[PDB]
Structure formats: C-alpha cells, structure tokens
Design a protein. Structure first.
Lengths: 133, 215, 202, 215, 215, 202
C-alpha cells in the first residue's frame, strides 16, 4: 500500500494470508468470500457462499492464502473507486475448551504477486523541521 | 475438496464413501453448478435426535443449481456431500451420517400421508421425530445397509459420501422427486461436563455431474 | 508518386499554438496553468476530430514574451503535472519543488523550452470521441474519458518579487509526433459551441 | 444467420460488411450470449428522419447478454447486425445503415451536454432530430467513411454489418460506454401512392465473441 | 543447536531464517566465543508490549565475547538467535520475532535524541513503549520486510534467525555501534482463562564467526 | 514487462530540491553554506529512509535567482568542501581560493552549474540509519555516523561590493546517481520531529 502510492497506475494480483492465532484446540469455521469489482459487498453468510469463497475450518489449519485475481487497478476510476471486497462470515461458533480463552484472534497479511506492476511515478501523499546553514 | 469458485480448506481429509461403489459419471446440457453449497450449520446438543436434508430439495433454491432447477425441467446429477463436525478432544458422541435412497417418510400415529410442507423443507432440512425407526417404520440399527459413514468424535470429525445417480429413470423432476436423503443421526449423544455442550455440524453439498433438459 | 505528404504523420505533426495566455507579476494566482488538451483552437480541433482514436507523443514548445508595464532576464519553471499528481494553486506552493513532476527551468533569453510528453493514456490510444460517461452513476459527464487526461502544464516565474511589474505572455506550441490514427470520421460542418462536447447550433 | 437457439430464416442473404475489414475474434469467460436479439420493428414512413441504437446499450437488459452485463463488470464483444426492411416492389426509398464507432452525440442549440436519459435509450433506441448532421455537427453525406450498407428498396431489402471490437482498451464497461451506434437514416424518403406508406424495418443484433470478467 | 560448551536440547527444531539469504562467513583473530548465550527469560503476559535486545550490546559484558569486546577494538560477527517460547496447548498469541538492521530508535513526544542509557541496555534489553510504530516512527505492520519469524503458540513455540554481518564497513566498534536489534513483539496478546497468564520467552544468542582486532 | 520503472535507480534518481536559501548582498555572513545531507525535505527523506544503506554519487545542480531590492550579470563561486577541509566563515576568507577544494565559477546568465560529487564515505555505503554513537564516550550523539558526512557546499558572489543591493536565491538540486541500495525498511508513518533523529509525536 505504501510503495504503490509512489506510483499512479498499479496492476497485478494480490494475495491475502489470514492467520488464526487462537489456542491449539480452538475449532470453528470461517467463510472468506471474494467480491469482484462492481459487485456489491455481501451482508449475509448465505450471499457470501454464493460467490467466490472459501470455507476455512481453522480447527487445525491456521493459515489461508486468498489469491486476488489480476485487477489493473487504475482502470476503474471516474479518485480511486472500488476494487472489490474480501469479507469474512462465521460459519460455526468458536469452539474452545474451558481452559483456553474464549476470545481468539485473526491477523491478515497482504503481498503482491509476481505479475504486479507499477508505473507513472508521483509523490507520496502520506508525508507532509526542527534543527546545516 | 475444491470445486468451482468454492473451496473447503479443512485438514483431516479422511476416507470418503462411494455410494454402492459407484462414481458419478455423465450420461453418455452440462463449472457453474459443480461447486460446494455449504448449508447453515446445525447445533448438535445433548438432546438432538437428528437432521435430514433431501436432495436435490436442499439445493432447489440456492445458486446456479436452484436457478437451473427452476428454469429447466429434467435433471441428472450425483452429489458430493462433506459433513464436518468440529469439536474439541473433550467432546464425545457418534453420528451416523447415512445417505438413504428414496427415503419415503411416514407420519407418526396417523393414517394420513405426509404433506408437501412436511417433506420439502429446503436448505433448513428437517429433524427426526423418531430417529430409532428412521421416521419410516424401519430401524436405525440396520440403516448401515445404506451408504453411510461414522463420525466418532474420538476418532474423526468429518465424513464424505459420494452419491451417484440413483433413479430407475435416466432423468428426473427436481421439484417433484427427491432421490437421496442425507441423514445425520447422533447414535451416541453429545457429552462434556457443561450440560450446554453445543458442537456445530457443517454440511456441504456439491452436485456432481449435473445435466439438464428443457430450458 | 506523391502520397508521402498526405501521410497522417505529415498531416498532423505541425507545431500549432495550443495555448496563449498572459499572466501578470505582483504581490491562476499570477502563474500559468493549462490543461493539456487539443480542443482549445478549432483549426487543430477539427483536424484531430477527423479520427476516432489517436496515439501520439506531444512535443511542447514554450515561448515566453516579456513586457514591462529594458527587459529583465528571468528564470521560468514549466512543470508537467500528470494525471495522478497535484497541481500548484499558488505561485509559491510546495508543489513547485516536486521531486517526481517533470520540471524544466529556462530563461527568457534562451531558445524556447522544448520537452516531449510521452503517450500518457492507460489505454492504447486517446479517444477523440467518447460515447460514454465518466462517472459510475448517472451524474457523470458525457463525452469525457477518464483515461485520456494528459495532465496539466504549470508555468511560473522562479524569481522572487521585483520592483518592476511586467506581463509574461506564454505561447505553448504542441507538435504531436509518432502519430498513429484509427477509424476516420466525417469533418465537422457546423461551428463548435463548447469545448466540452459536440453540440451544434445550425 | 443461425446463432444459438435463434434463427433468421430470411431469403435474400446478400453481401455482408466486415467493419474495417475485421472479423470478431476472441482475445488471446466465454452459445448463451451468441444469438440474434431481434429488436422491435420500427415503422418507416414518409416523414421518418432515422433511428439509432447504441451497442451494447440496446442489449444491456435483454436475455443472457443483459444478465451477464449486469452481473459482470468488463465485456468484450463484436456484433453481427442484420437490418432487414421488407416492402413490396411498389415501394421506393434508400436507407443508409451505418455503424458509427464512438458516436458521441451533441445536443442542438444549447451548450449543455446530453444527459444520461438522452443517450442511454435501450431496446427502443432513438430517433435522429437532425439526421443531416448526424446529430453531432458533422455530415450525413460523408458518413460513408464509417462501416455502412445501403438498402435501396429497388435493389435490396437487407443489410448485414459485422462489427469487431472497437476500443482503445482491451475490455470495457457495458453500462458506462457504448462503442457502436447502429444508425438507419432514410436518405431517399419512402414513397408509394397512398401517403400512409408504413414499411417495417427489423433490426437483429447478435453479439459475437462475448467475453466477460468480474462476476 | 550445539555450539561450544553450550547446548540447547530442545525438541521442535523447526525451520530457521537466514537473514537476507546470507550465511555468516569469515572475512577472507578467530570455539571460545561461538557458543549460545542464553539470556534471562522474560515473562510474556497479557499486557506485554514487546522486548528488544541490541547486538552486540546484549553480549558486551557476557563471557568470552564480552571479554574480547572490552579487550579488542574491532569486531566482525554474525549471530545465531534462537527464541523459544514454551507454553501449553491452552495458551494463545502470536509473536513477531523480527531482527532489525540499524534500528535507530526515536524518542516519543520530544525533539531530544535518545541518550546512551536509553539505547545501551545490555543483557536486560528493553521494552517497547509504542510497539505499533516500532519505537521509531515507522510501522509494525510493515516490519516483516526485515528478517523475521512468527511464533504462533497454536503452531510453533520457537524461532531461529541466522544473522550475517550487516555493516557498510568491514569491521566495527562493538561498544559504539549496534547492528542488529532482535525484537519480540506480541502481535496477538496472550490468553488463557486465568488472567495472570505468564508464558516465558527464552532468548539464546550465539555469535557466529567472530573476528577481532586490536588487543 | 514493466519492472524497469520500479528500479531503485529509477525510483531514487530524481533531481529534487535539496536546499533553497536566499542571501543578501551588502558590506552565513552574506554567502551560502549548506551541509550536504538529504534530511532537509521530508519527501526525499522518506524515500531514502526506505533503505538501510545507500551508495550513490550526487549530481548537484545550482540554480541562481537574482532580484535587486535591471538585473546585473554576476559571477558566483560554488565550492565543495569535503569532510577534512575547512569551510569559509566569511565572504572574503582565504578558504575561497583553496587549491584543493573543488570550486566552480559560473554566471547568472549561464545554464545552471552542475557538478558530480562522488561517493564520499569511508565505508562502502552511507548508513541512512545508524544505531550507534559518534563519540567514543557517553556524550556522543545518537544516530550520527562520522563516516557518512559528505561535506559542505559553500556558495558566494565572487564580485566585490556594488552600489545596488540584491537578494540571491540559490536553489540546489541533487540527483543521486549510480544508486545501490540495501536492506529495505518500513515507511515512516508518523511526521518527523527533527532532522537529527527519528523521534515521533503520534
């Protein structure tokens, strides 16, 4: 996200890794759906399982990679508009034993894939001094 | 377990069950319908008698299968069912995940047949009233004559049954006739020292080798 | 034979005046800004609107005229701000020392400043005509492709404020080059009513 | 002229027009959309100025194309247009069936751009206000620089224009941007001794080689 | 994990991390220093923000390395770091064991630089005040650009990072300049139903390929 | 493919403004002195602080603007004083005729003065970040490597004192070249508080 804001036009596939950081015996199922650009973000678990989704049992698999297909980025602006959504719904409940904490956590990662590309270099809008002459 | 734009990234991908030793093949119009349809999870408790889903009635209003069912007129499909029941190592209980061909139900203590509303339940499916007789006068004890799997939570948490085309006819009406009934009966009830033990069971039904006629 | 003069490379590559604007000099807040398009002058507009799609590199020549209201020798900056970057709103903004915007620093006494702007579209050609809407809703503007915006040419006087006051006329000459052209169109027979659209009076 | 479950069983299958000498090929998801969509017939009379349809706006609410347009997000298609104008041997008149790339319209006697409602007309299409300038300030006389056909009712009654993908981009938004405008302008007006001569014109648009992205 | 007269007889010897794909080699005076120095264990709790150790400052007063540091004058060494975090299967939490080259710290809400006492902490190391910005204005989220490992207590309990010589110079002053900062930040905090959960983290630093000059 | 625009040679080699200072002219004692670093402007500071070690040659362009408080034609000297040499403290010191310091004598009317400063470190790269102390005792300064000091750029007006008084704005443009870069770092998310250090407010 930061190195792309040095460039104007990005294009490529992203990947999202989600990592489950609960206890060893915490079980459950999530459903990570991917919404393509222009489509609307789902609000129900049933609408999410009708799209491109994945049914992730984190009962023993505590990592899921979600490949986001090739976008072309700056081709969808009228100001960047909408590039899609990755949502997550509960499928089951979180099933923990009584000695594990009942609150578990997910962390998510994102990298770009090898077909990612950046062009037309600009300045970063992120940065906008005390103490040589 | 990756069909279509759907995927089940589970772990313990144990042995599956070809029903009657048969794999679903095409009949010698056909990626859209061949995908997992993960139903809503049911809550298995200590007082659960069982759950059933009739096929393809559990899929006749869902997605690219339920569109084609209500636009076409004949269908021919097998089914891949993946039942997964995620619990801890402190839970116990056995499920009989049995797939029944032509499970004509019967009603209890009346001579009137079951109605349309008692049979065609949809994605919610039903609940066994008398699971010991399988709600049809027979027996649960002999129900392992059907294509079945066991989920002993001590041993395994998932069950996969691969169903072929079970019909006397080459194609069939999806809105009229159900051919398979996925039934999940807890033979040994659920148990851990909390009394409100509530293990979830997840049912994913992928219709394999769907054919259609009469758009 | 004689066909080499009606080549589209020869038909279109002429350094025509695309922008002439004066700006003053005292304490567009006293600088030049021009959105690089081609619809400013109807003689060049009608030649490029003989086609549907164009793909050219632009060759901007900047010709600075000074006249005091004894001519001083002054440094000008001419910064190309592409679509995605931020233009100056003032003469002394921080956008004039952008590291990434292509600036050129030139004098009045010099030969005119000449730079080549590349092909800047995200598509393979500029849509001269666009039968479409820019916004994703009904409030969008008709005939405007968001892909086709070149950028802006921002010209200021680098020097700080002086006692004399003068007028700086900036003539911009654009020669398109490496012209490829697709799908020719009928010439416009009616006068133009606006630069935004193809409206016609009769 | 037989695409999909549609068919045009006409007779005088005369010469067609590949637009700019190009046939629609696929770009190196793809029977459902590749079919003729026969629009509602227009009535050509003695006072007709002309008719236009923007593509794919004339098809964005019709059938398996208009479903995929409103479910996907990028499209890429050519078009096969068959205009047929059936009359007797006592009718007269010439039509210019011209297909215009990027027909950015202009409004008349105002400086305000045409709105969304003035441009996106759908299956009904529009009517030329000033067909002599092609409703964009140019000329009808030079409009044979575009891919065109003639329908002289003395000579022929039909016209087929085969349109490729005309875009600077590889794919495109169907609900935002129109790429072809099929225009049918009566150059010589209609005539037979009855004054209420009302010859029908039928437009059939088959979207060839449709691709899509972003379901 | 057996260097010198030291040995770590752990069990789950998982994958290590060569930092930037580089193994420590000698530069083309050299068993005494090449040994594991097991630091004092830190207590990871639910309110922990993180721990850091600067290298070789964490070893400049320990053993045959800290003798040679204070007798010589130039050094050149890689490092083998083994972080191990032993907990039960009822604990949860993720650590980012990240090794930062040239981690110039910054102070919070002042324009005065950090002093000698704020930077050179020794075997005790330090504690992150603001681990979200890595105590230097950047970000913890992008800190996986550095050589790092994860300790998800669900998955693994140990992390090994092999650090080469990171310097613009061929040798360096050990008492002046630190080259690596081992940082251990709990990204997901610790959790088991007792509130006073106190999982230990053990850091063992073996200086690999030590060279020296200027006795 | 497209990877040749995110090359570090292309990512970093842009002639960005590194120093803009005016100085006056009457009887920094009326001359320009700038310690050649890169932390003056936060747009260039944040790009180079995406890395741990850098090795570049600098390409200093000096752009002189004059304005009298009728512009005269004046000679300027721009002397690079490396680390080890002595800088001027006055406009008319003896250090302006150093035989060994690299001076460049240029006019206002000329094209801008451009010199290339080589790689000046005693190590193989400049430490952008330095987790160390410069002094051999505890009173040393944190984050300052003595090896990484480029030198100073001292600019004066060679001409002796004139009747008119004017302001000389000196814009310095540095383009790093032959960039090698090592060990990338996270970008800075908080604002800078000082050029001496990496302190942060929140």
């Amino acid at each position: 996200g930061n190195i792309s804001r040095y460039y104007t036009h990005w294009s490529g596939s992203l990947e999202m890794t989600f990592m489950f950081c609960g206890s060893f015996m915490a079980a459950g199922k999530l459903i990570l759906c991917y919404t393509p650009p222009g489509g609307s973000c789902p609000t129900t678990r049933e609408t999410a399982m009708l799209g491109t989704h994945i049914v992730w049992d984190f009962g023993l698999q505590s990592s899921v990679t979600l490949i986001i297909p090739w976008i072309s980025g700056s081709h969808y602006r009228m100001t960047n508009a909408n590039v899609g959504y990755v949502t997550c719904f509960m499928q089951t409940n979180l099933i923990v034993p009584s000695e594990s904490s009942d609150t578990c956590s997910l962390i998510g990662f994102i990298a770009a894939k090898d077909d990612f590309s950046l062009r037309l270099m600009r300045d970063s809008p992120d940065i906008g001094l005390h103490a040589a002459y | 377990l990756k069909l279509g734009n759907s995927a089940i990234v589970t772990q313990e991908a144990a042995n599956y069950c070809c029903a009657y030793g048969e794999w679903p093949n095409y009949l010698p119009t056909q990626t859209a319908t061949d995908r997992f349809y993960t139903l809503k999870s049911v809550k298995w408790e200590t007082g659960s008698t069982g759950w059933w889903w009739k096929l393809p009635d559990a899929l006749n209003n869902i997605g690219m299968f339920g569109q084609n069912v209500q636009h076409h007129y004949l269908y021919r499909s097998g089914f891949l069912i993946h039942v997964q029941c995620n619990a801890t190592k402190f839970h116990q209980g056995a499920l009989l995940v049995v797939a029944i061909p032509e499970h004509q139900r019967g009603a209890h203590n009346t001579n009137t047949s079951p109605g349309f509303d008692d049979i065609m339940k949809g994605e919610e499916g039903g609940t066994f009233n008398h699971p010991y007789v399988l709600d049809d006068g027979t027996s649960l004890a002999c129900a392992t004559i059907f294509p079945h799997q066991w989920i002993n939570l001590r041993t395994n948490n998932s069950a996969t049954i691969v169903l072929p085309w079970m019909n006397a006819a080459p194609m069939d009406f999806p809105l009229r006739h159900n051919q398979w009934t996925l039934a999940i009966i807890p033979v040994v009830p659920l148990g851990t020292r909390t009394t409100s033990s509530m293990v979830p069971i997840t049912v994913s039904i992928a219709p394999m080798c769907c054919e259609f006629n009469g758009l | 034979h004689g066909v080499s003069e009606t080549l589209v490379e020869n038909f279109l590559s002429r350094a025509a005046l695309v922008s002439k604007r004066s700006f003053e000099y005292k304490d567009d807040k006293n600088f030049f800004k021009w959105t690089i398009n081609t619809r400013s002058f109807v003689q060049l507009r009608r030649k490029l609107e003989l086609f549907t799609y164009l793909r050219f590199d632009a060759e901007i020549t900047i010709l600075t005229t000074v006249a005091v209201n004894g001519l001083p020798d002054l440094t000008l900056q001419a910064m190309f701000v592409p679509t995605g970057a931020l233009t100056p709103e003032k003469q002394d903004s921080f956008h004039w020392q952008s590291g990434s915007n292509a600036s050129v620093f030139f004098k009045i006494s010099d030969p005119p400043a000449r730079i080549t702007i590349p092909f800047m579209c995200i598509n393979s050609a500029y849509s001269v005509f666009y039968d479409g809407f820019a916004g994703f809703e009904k409030n969008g503007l008709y005939g405007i492709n968001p892909a086709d915006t070149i950028g802006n040419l921002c010209v200021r006087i680098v020097n700080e404020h002086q006692p004399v006051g003068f007028t700086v006329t900036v003539r911009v000459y654009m020669k398109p080059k490496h012209i490829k052209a697709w799908a020719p169109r009928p010439p416009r027979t009616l006068p133009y009513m606006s630069i935004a659209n193809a409206n016609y009076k009769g």
